[PDB]
Amino acid sequence: LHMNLIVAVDGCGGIGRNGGMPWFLPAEMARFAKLTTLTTDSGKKNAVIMGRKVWESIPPKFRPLKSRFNVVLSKKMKEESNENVVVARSFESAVSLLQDMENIETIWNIGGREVYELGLNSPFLHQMYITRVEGDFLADVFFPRVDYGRFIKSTESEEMHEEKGIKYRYEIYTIKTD
Numbered sequence: 001l002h003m004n005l006i007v008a009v010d011g012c013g014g015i016g017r018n019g020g021m022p023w024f025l026p027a028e029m030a031r032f033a034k035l036t037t038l039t040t041d042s043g044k045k046n047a048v049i050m051g052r053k054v055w056e057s058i059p060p061k062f063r064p065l066k067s068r069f070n071v072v073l074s075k076k077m078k079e080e081s082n083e084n085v086v087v088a089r090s091f092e093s094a095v096s097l098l099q100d101m102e103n104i105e106t107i108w109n110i111g112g113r114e115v116y117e118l119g120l121n122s123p124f125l126h127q128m129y130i131t132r133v134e135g136d137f138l139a140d141v142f143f144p145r146v147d148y149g150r151f152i153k154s155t156e157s158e159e160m161h162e163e164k165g166i167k168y169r170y171e172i173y174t175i176k177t178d
């Protein structure tokens, strides 16, 4: 059972501004949905684990994230009536429930700085799929401080991408104990 982190950070390490995203990148978001949705074993599902403010920053039409199992960490949210969503009061309990479910193939840590930090300290930590966006978007939330020395960066050829006047590039990292 793998836990991969997926994030889009800017030149300063920013991920959030004013409770929302500092940018909108539809092609990047499409790649995000593909990476987080597609499983190898047909019929098996992925799980996304997110913090409450991520959940609330998703457009409610796209919410819950379709074809995935949503786990929202929150100490304040009421239980979610929907079946593809569960509210988990702690990281450890969320990870316990996920490793308990048989049909979950890969757990995608999709955001919340604290969610990211707890994942980075997790035994299930596998890969980081980072989208390095160029420039300073005046973010107020950031990605955790991470020791990249624990990781091996994939060497595949990664071109630059540009949409909406914004440039960015994909990077992949794998924990060195694999």
Ligand SMILES: NC(=O)c1ccc[n+]([C@@H]2O[C@H](COP(=O)([O-])OP(=O)(O)OC[C@H]3O[C@@H](n4cnc5c(N)ncnc54)[C@H](OP(=O)(O)O)[C@@H]3O)[C@@H](O)[C@H]2O)c1
Binding pocket: 006, 007, 008, 009, 014, 015, 016, 017, 018, 019, 020, 021, 050, 051, 052, 053, 054, 055, 057, 073, 074, 075, 076, 077, 088, 089, 090, 091, 110, 111, 112, 113, 114, 115, 118, 141
């Ligand atoms: N650029 C990106 O790739 C990216 C990735 C994700 C999000 N974002 C942006 O980043 C910002 C949100 O990230 P955030 O870090 O500010 O808020 P968040 O982490 O998304 O959600 C924070 C909330 O999650 C809950 N939570 C987190 N860890 C928990 C734990 N261990 N146990 C229990 N509850 C826990 C708490 O909810 P309660 O307050 O209800 O306890 C906490 O207040 C938004 O702007 C979002 O759009 C961007």
Ligand SMILES: CN(Cc1cnc2nc(N)nc(N)c2n1)c1ccc(C(=O)N[C@@H](CCC(=O)O)C(=O)O)cc1
Binding pocket: 006, 007, 008, 020, 021, 026, 027, 028, 029, 030, 032, 033, 034, 054, 057, 058, 059, 062, 065, 066, 109, 110, 111, 130, 131
């Ligand atoms: C605010 N937020 C958090 C968020 C945004 N961008 C990211 N970008 C990356 N690279 N990684 C992340 N974890 C990430 N997280 C959002 C907002 C909307 C949707 C969303 O609606 N996704 C659709 C896909 C949207 C699309 O196809 O354009 C899906 O079904 O997955 C996801 C995350």
